[PDB]
Each structure stands twice: as C-alpha cells, then as structure tokens.
Amino acid sequence: MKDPRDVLKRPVITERSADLMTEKKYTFEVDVRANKTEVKDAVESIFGVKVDKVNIMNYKGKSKRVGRYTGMTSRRRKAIVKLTADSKEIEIF
Amino acid sequence: MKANEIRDLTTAEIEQKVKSLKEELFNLRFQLATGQLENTARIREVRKAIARMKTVIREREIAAN
Amino acid sequence: HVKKGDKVMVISGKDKGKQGTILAAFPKKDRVLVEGVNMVKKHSKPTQANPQGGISNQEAPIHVSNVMPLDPKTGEVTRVGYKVEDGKKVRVAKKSGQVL
RNA sequence: AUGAGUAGCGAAAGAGGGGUGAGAAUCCCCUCCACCGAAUGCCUAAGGUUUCCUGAGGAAGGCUCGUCCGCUCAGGGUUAGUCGGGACCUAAGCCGAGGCCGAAAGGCGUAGGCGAUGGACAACAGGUUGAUAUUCCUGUACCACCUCCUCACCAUUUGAGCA
RNA sequence: GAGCUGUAAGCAAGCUUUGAUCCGGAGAUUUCCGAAUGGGGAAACCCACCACUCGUAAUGGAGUGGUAUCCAUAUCUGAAUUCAUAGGAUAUGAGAAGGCAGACCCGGGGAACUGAAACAUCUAAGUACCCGGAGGAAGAGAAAGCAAAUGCGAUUCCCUGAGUAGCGGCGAGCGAAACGGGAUCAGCCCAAACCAAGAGGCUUGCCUCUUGGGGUUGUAGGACACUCUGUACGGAGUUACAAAGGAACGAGGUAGAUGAAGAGGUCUGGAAAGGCCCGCCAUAGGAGGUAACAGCCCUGUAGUCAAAACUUCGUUCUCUCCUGAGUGGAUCCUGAGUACGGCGGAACACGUGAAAUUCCGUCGGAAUCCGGGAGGACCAUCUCCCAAGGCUAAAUACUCCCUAGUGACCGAUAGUGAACCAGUACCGUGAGGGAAAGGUGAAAAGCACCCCGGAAGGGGAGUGAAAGAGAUCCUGAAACCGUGUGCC
C-alpha cells in the first residue's frame, strides 16, 4: 500500500514552470496528504534520478459563478523538486 | 475477460499485472496533462480493468477462510 | 412496434400516403425518422462551415403511432403480433401468416 | 399616481499640451502649481477572504460621465532544520477514574489532565520577477541526532555512563 | 432484444447481436467526523505505545492489526495484620448505554390564565410541560366476585342503563356501577409448604443438596397418610401450560409473457379522433397519448400464465415430552404483614364525613379450618367466597413507512411554509423567524442573406396555420402615460 505512483498526479505547465525547468527544477501536483519524504522517494523510484531538495505548498479553492448557481473548486498541493548537477534530466514531454 | 482472470494464478494476478496497469494509467494521465492523448476512453477502461482484478483477488482471499 | 431499416407507410398527417424506410429511432420519446418525409428548411447558423450555408432540406422525426408496417404477402397496412418462438420470439403479421 | 423636473448629489486646488477612441471637464503620458509630514509616511495585529498579477469588456453597480475601477469574463500567483504555533512548561479557570450528596434529571470533588495574555529555545549581508522571499540565488555560519562504511587518541565493575 | 455513454440541449473520443444500455435477488469495496471508544480538541483536525512488514544505518520516513470506561466468568496475588480490601492478566457483551414516528401506553413530579358576573372552598385539571421505561401493541386475568333467586361464573371493548343514583359557599358544576343485548374465546395453568428417599455436609444433633412428589384446593375441601389404575398414547406442534431441530407439498411478495376488431368512402381544414353515408370486436367501451373529441393507431385493459435466488404463511411426516381414580387418624394447608393508633397525605364520581373500599410514611401488632373475609359506620342471624407467590393468545389503540385505489375536495393571493435547485434567499451573537417566483410552437422549423447603427435596437427578405408567436414568447381588463381630430 502506498504505491509510489499514487503520490504524483500530473505535471504543471506554465511560463513560470518552464522558466524554472530551465534550471533543473520541476513542478508537480501531489496528493494532499503526502509529506516531502514520500515525494522525494517517489521521484527517485519512478524516474531514476538524484534529488537534492524538495519544497511544498498548499492552495485553497476558488469561487465560481456558472449560471445562477455558486460553488467552489477543490484544494491543491504543489511540489518543486531540484535534481543534482550530475543527475540526468527527467523527460517531461 | 473475467474467466481469463480466474485462469491466472494469484501472484500473477497482482505481480506484473495490477502493476503494469498502474504504470500505464500513470503515463496516460501524464500525456493527457501535457496535451497530446487523442483517444481518451483508455483511462476509463484501464480503471475498470484494475477494479476487476482487485475484486477477484479479494473474492479468492475471502473464500480461503 | 417497429425498428430501424423497415419499410413503413405513413397513415396520418400532412404526409399520409407516402412510404419509405426508417433511418433512425428514438425509443426515449417515441419519435422515428422516416426517409423522405416531413422536409424542413433549416436556416443554418452564420457560416461555421467551408461555405456560409443557410438553406438545407433535411428530415424531421414523426411520432411512432403515425406509421405502421407493411404485410410481406399482400403488401399493405397490417397490425403486428409477436410470439412464434422459432427458437426466439419473432414479430409476425396479423393479416397474413408471414413473418416480420 | 400627487408633491415635481422640486430638495439633494456626503469637509479638500488645479491649468495647459499631447494621446487613444464611434464618442473624453472626468482615462494614459509630460510640464508647471497646490496639500500632509508624533502623519494623509512604513510594518503588522484582530477581522476580511482572492479583493493581488496579466489580457479582454462596456448589459447592471460607481449619487454625473466614462475608452476607467476594489465591477464582469478568462488565465496565472503564496517555496523555511534557524521567523510564529505543534511532536517543551505551567497561571486564573475548566474537565474529572474511584468517591460524597440528591424524587429522577443532576451538584460537588481526589489522583490525573487541558489551557498564553507569561517562561525555554540554532542565520546574517547582498541580488532578482508582471505578481513570493531571514523561505528562491551567491557568499560565509550555527544547532540536535546517527555511524551505512569510516579515521586518530583512548575499553568493563581495573566504572564509563546515572535524574 | 437494439441501440447506448444522467439532467444537459454543445463537442470530441468510444462501446454493443460474441448481445450493450436497462429492471429484480444475492455478494464485494466503503476516505474523514459523529455514542466515538489509544490520548487531546475550537465536529470534519493534531500527537502516540506494542507486534509484525517495506526502505537506508538510525530518525522522524511508510503500511497492516491491537490499545476507552462500566458489568458479569474464571485465575493468582494478597497491605495495615497470620484474612478479607485492593492489584493484575483471560475470554466478555456480536456491550448498550446512542438515535427516532411531532402517533399509540405504563410510572414519578405537576402549573396558571379562565368560570363561579367580585373571591379563598370548588372549576380549569391530573390538562400543558419535564423526567424514567418500553412493545408492535402495551395494560388488565382465572373471585376471600356480583347479588338476594329461579341465581350467574377469568379479562378486555361497543350499545343501553343515564345526565339516572349520588357529591356540591346544596352554588357553578362534576358524574358512576350492577342488570340486559353483542365481538372473541382458555378450567389457562405453574410454584417444596406437610412428606419421603437417597449425600454430605455434619460436635450427638443440624440443613441445604438433588430428586420425586403437590395446590385445574373452599360447599373446607384438598394434600401428607390409605385401597386402584397403564403406562403407550395423548399433548407440544413449540403461543402460558419443558424445550432444541430437520424433510417434503400448496398459496403468496420482490422483474415479466401473451393478448380481438376500419388506412372504409366522402366534406371542411395547417393537421380528423369531427360532420354525412357504411362495417366489425367484446369475460376486453378502465385509463393515457397521438398536429382537434378514438372500443377497432400506439402503450394498454378483461382473461390466462410465469422465478435461478432470497423471503411470508399453511398442511403433513420426522422429532422430543409418563399416568389418572376409591378410604379416615396426626400433620401441612404454601404465603406474618394482618388489622390498629395518631398523622399526614392517597385514590376513590364522593369536597373527613353517616361513611364503607384502595395505597404511602410513623409507633405498637394475630390464629390456624371446631379457622378467616364480605354483603357502604358498627350490631346478632342468613348468604356468598379463601388474601399476604407467578405466567397467559383473541376480540381493542395509533401511522414514520410500502402497495393499490377513491372523492356533489383545491386549481398558482387557492392547495403543504414550499407545483420552480425551499426550510433555500434574507434577518438575528444565539435559541429563533421566514419569503417571492407556472404556460413560445404539433415540430426549433429559434429569423441564411441585404440595409442603418460602435453595440443595443430596428426596416426588408425568409420558416410557420398564425412573427400583432421572436425568448418572463397563451388570453390579455383597470388605475396611469401619450399622438390625431368634430363641438365649445
């Protein structure tokens, strides 16, 4: 239980994400109940690279007004990993 | 495919079977997030297959006691 | 009481007398789409195609109770009845001894 | 509906030249002029909750106008071993195993806990984006724990450690 | 048995006759909170210990199980003290405390406004409300009864008795019971008390221990004691009367199948189910749709049939369970809290009184069948009946639900507060209060194109039976606001 592919959900592709990716940093969306250590091990196992540091952050939901109804979107958790200088680059397509 | 599921032995029905489906789902979701997937029923059919495998394994385990 | 790909005959409406084949079925609303019947002149939306397009001539659905099939033998309007169970329940004609 | 195109439009200095636009007293740029300065400056509580950044908009809201906005529609944005709180401590008060009272419901209270507005406790200078920075980047540091494999002196009541 | 991927109408990407989507029976998975139970807490969150397991050397890293308090059952361990308190570890208890249907029923507390033309006694009323227990119903039960002869025979509910007898500042008012007619049926039964055997405690002795046995016990005659009886054949059918279980048939519930007969001709209409002229079906003219009003157009109706799997009753078989009668001389008669004395209550329809009857506190307090209680104070005769131990179906009450129906009930200011994303929006610190809002057309066939305009909005052209039908789009009144004009 706690397979590593359950921690990572999907990559993040913006201008900021590519700017960071220029410097061997990669941005992911992870499960809302996973701490930095499982993120580190999961990245190590899935891709086979060397990890140096991990930084994590929490996001709240947003209010939307489609039609005459109102609601809220779901929370998010974002992680930024930094590979070492010798490690290969992860082929994020 | 349920009969073919039963035919496999227990370790084969989890090892190298519920693992390949997991990794395939991972790659599929990555491709969709990037923006190039085309066919999109693959996600649903893969998830249904995984549920099938888990249910047959659990049925075996329950019947074992 | 009738399905896709059958020869029917319209018995009521502005198109009574005409006959054709079924092209689609809508079991949810009891509407059917007979070929060559109930033509409409749809004013197509602004362009949204290679030409502009604003005049078409397509078909419109008809309530299912306004059509009913043709007897294979005599060849006219005939009520329908099931249960021959020739290995499987199969529709039969009433004003004949025939099938479908 | 009448009162009636009447009362009001909520303390304060602007003028010109460009611009953009279907449209400008009211929006952008420039130059002069004016007001606060133990604040109308900066940083940051409680409380608020996306109001923050970029591109479009001209139905409703702005006591007028509007090409503009804390308004409407789409995308983005918040990085900590050292900062504040928890894997530390207790005050007033509160809860309370057994226990003592009381037609019932309940009231009080010992051992034991919870509870900051207080006590303990390791990091500083500079740079950078349209939106974060003792957190990101570059330099020099400190603190607790382990020996994965180590290294040098130095091993059993011939006592190291021990509150 | 042919299409399908919910509202939801775009849009891609897919699946199914190798039978999808869909309907019913049985299974599996089931994040976090909540009685919430490892500890804490501002419900939706933090922090642990012990066993294994993953990963490096550890940490915090990660996964799967266990760990609340109280009550019963065994154990070993026993302070002050040579014993009992207290302490551990067991399997617990599929704990049950927790919830609800704003209904029905048992018990404990228990108002006031109001009426009496004012007001204490009375009434409101053992009502409202609070607390504790339940069950599918609860409660009540087999005479120490009614009553007055000819006597009847456990309880409960309806009709009548009857607004009668009775209580009452004799006011206002409150208000029975028995007899008679019905609904269901049960003479329903069980208890060690006198006795016996045995045991095994046990100073001789005892006194519990288990068995028999005994009470369908009152006309006071049963029982203990004393003469017969057949023990298989009857009762549970497990609903009181002991209690566990199986095996076959039948009828239902949860999904379905089949099911007669007009395109009749003709007229008007955008469209016939309508008009006129003709036919058929019926154990089927109950309903709802379809471009207008349908027994013969569609889904259906009357009749017949249906179940792998769970369930509800009924019958039978298996299967368990051992008795009832005649006779008199000591002993049990199961039941010591009865009944008093105040004193309060306390219920009785009855307000302490002429008053019987029932209960609760407090002082004293029985006899034994040649006895005891009652017949509305007592008082002698007569007549009925045996308290101080238990169990018991049916006939009655009430709907949170589910299934099928029906109304000289409503028709959008009505009917539920709510026909519409309603206990919502709003208001309040909180308990709490609480709205407004239905209709295009048969079918979107929802206005290509041209012109004015920044757009909004128009004028043409088209669809349609209708465009004065064009998005709060059926009909559309009045108040209110305007344009033109005949007479002043």
Side-chain angles (χ1 to χ4, degrees), chain A residues 22-44:
Chain A
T22 323
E23 322 328 336
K24 264 178 180 264
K25 289 222 229 256
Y26 302 87
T27 320
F28 298 105
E29 250 188 32
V30 298
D31 192 284
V32 299
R33 336 170 275 202
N35 64 332
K36 330 166 83 133
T37 321
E38 335 181 55
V39 183
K40 163 181 268 231
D41 315 336
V43 172
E44 301 259 17

Side-chain angles (χ1 to χ4, degrees), chain B residues 38-41 44-45 55 58 62:
Chain B
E38 265 292 302
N39 180 18
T40 37
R44 203 177 289 249
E45 58 198 33
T55 206
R58 168 79 192 181
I62 271 292

